[PDB]
Design a protein around this ligand. Structure first.
Ligand SMILES: CCCCCCCCO[C@@H]1O[C@H](CO)[C@H](O)[C@H](N)[C@H]1O[C@H]1C[C@H](O)[C@H](O)[C@H](C)O1
Ligand SMILES: O=c1ccn([C@@H]2O[C@H](COP(=O)(O)OP(=O)(O)O)[C@@H](O)[C@H]2O)c(=O)[nH]1
Ligand SMILES: [Mn+2]
Length: 290
């Protein structure tokens, strides 16, 4: 049951004077695409707080990537779901290397010890297995799961505007690209295969989520697809991201996040279309850190 919102005073939405004219703000299957200027966060905060929403955030910090946790968590404290209940789940091979970060009220962190795979590709891909079935606490502990890369920092608000049964995030390198340029898996022998005449968007492996049920469905399906591929002696070109893309093509997300939500300023600057940079890549040496 969902109670009434209280009286609220805010600017009237204007039917004939749209928020954003420069970007697509709804997909052809009527999922909102979340950009600054499309939402009133006060209304959304009310809706979600009235449901006592708890958000789980999973993050993997395997081997050298433990180095990224301090900034990741400190900035999450400033910017991620502030005012709501948050449960961080840090999956790591080094529980003792997890920094002691001070958390605001209603926020908690659990350290989950996992095995470290040799290949970075396997570390990245096996997140699907580890999230899916391996973890059973999620259903009892949180309402939504948000699954992100650790080599990142929050720079601005990331809040309940993202919550929905199933969401993906537009990859910052491809949001203006034609589908033929998307780096989908193109080999028909892979479960991740998408031909050149299919595809809505290229979604980023670094930021997806939804209800616990929908995230566990997605992660289970991607894990099983990866197992089929492995048996067939094929590894998809972009690993978990390739499978995520196939899944979201066939199971349309109920919101899509704009690249505000996954940006790389070093690589891509700050184009006019982005009013905020919310969650951004932390520069790293790929060869050294892996
Ligand atoms: C310089 C490196 C070139 C990166 C440009 C594209 O980003 C990569 O796109 C791939 C799909 O075509 C996969 O999504 C890779 N995971 C992705 O690389 C990451 C790390 C990379 O350092 C940037 O942060 C980029 C935006 O995202
Ligand atoms: O040695 C590794 C390799 C990968 N990861 C995890 O897998 C995610 C995806 O890998 P990475 O960030 O290297 O991919 P990229 O963003 O460079 O495409 C990382 O954010 C970590 O959460 C990790 O913990 N240790
Ligand atoms: Mn990353």
């Amino acid at each position: 049951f969902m109670v009434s919102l209280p009286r609220m005073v805010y600017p009237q939405p204007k039917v004939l004077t749209p928020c954003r004219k420069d970007v697509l703000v709804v997909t052809p299957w009527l999922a909102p695409i979340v950009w600054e200027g499309t939402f009133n966060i006060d209304i959304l905060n009310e809706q979600f707080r009235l449901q006592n929403t708890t958000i789980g955030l999973t993050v993997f910090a395997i081997k050298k990537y433990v180095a990224f946790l301090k900034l990741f968590l400190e900035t999450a404290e400033k910017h991620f779901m502030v005012g709501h209940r948050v449960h961080y789940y840090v999956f790591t091979d080094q529980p003792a290397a997890v920094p002691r970060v001070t958390l605001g009220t209603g926020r908690q962190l659990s350290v989950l010890e996992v095995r470290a795979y040799k290949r970075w590709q396997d570390v990245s891909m096996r997140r699907m297995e580890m999230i899916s079935f391996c973890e059973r606490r999620f259903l009892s502990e949180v309402d939504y799961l948000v699954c992100v890369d650790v080599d990142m920092e929050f720079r601005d608000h990331v809040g309940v505007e993202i919550l929905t049964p199933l969401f993906g995030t537009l990859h910052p390198s491809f949001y203006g690209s034609s589908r033929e340029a998307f780096t989908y898996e193109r080999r028909p022998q892979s479960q991740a295969y998408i031909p050149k005449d299919e595809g809505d968007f290229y979604y980023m492996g670094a930021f997806f989520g939804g209800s616990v049920q929908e995230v566990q469905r997605l992660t289970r399906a991607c894990h099983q697809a990866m197992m089929v591929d492995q048996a067939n002696g094929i590894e998809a070109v972009w690993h978990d991201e390739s499978h995520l893309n196939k899944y979201l093509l066939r199971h349309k997300p109920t919101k899509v996040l704009s690249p505000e939500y996954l940006w790389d300023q070093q690589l891509l600057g700050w184009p006019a279309v982005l009013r905020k940079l919310r969650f951004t890549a932390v520069p790293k040496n790929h060869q050294a850190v892996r």
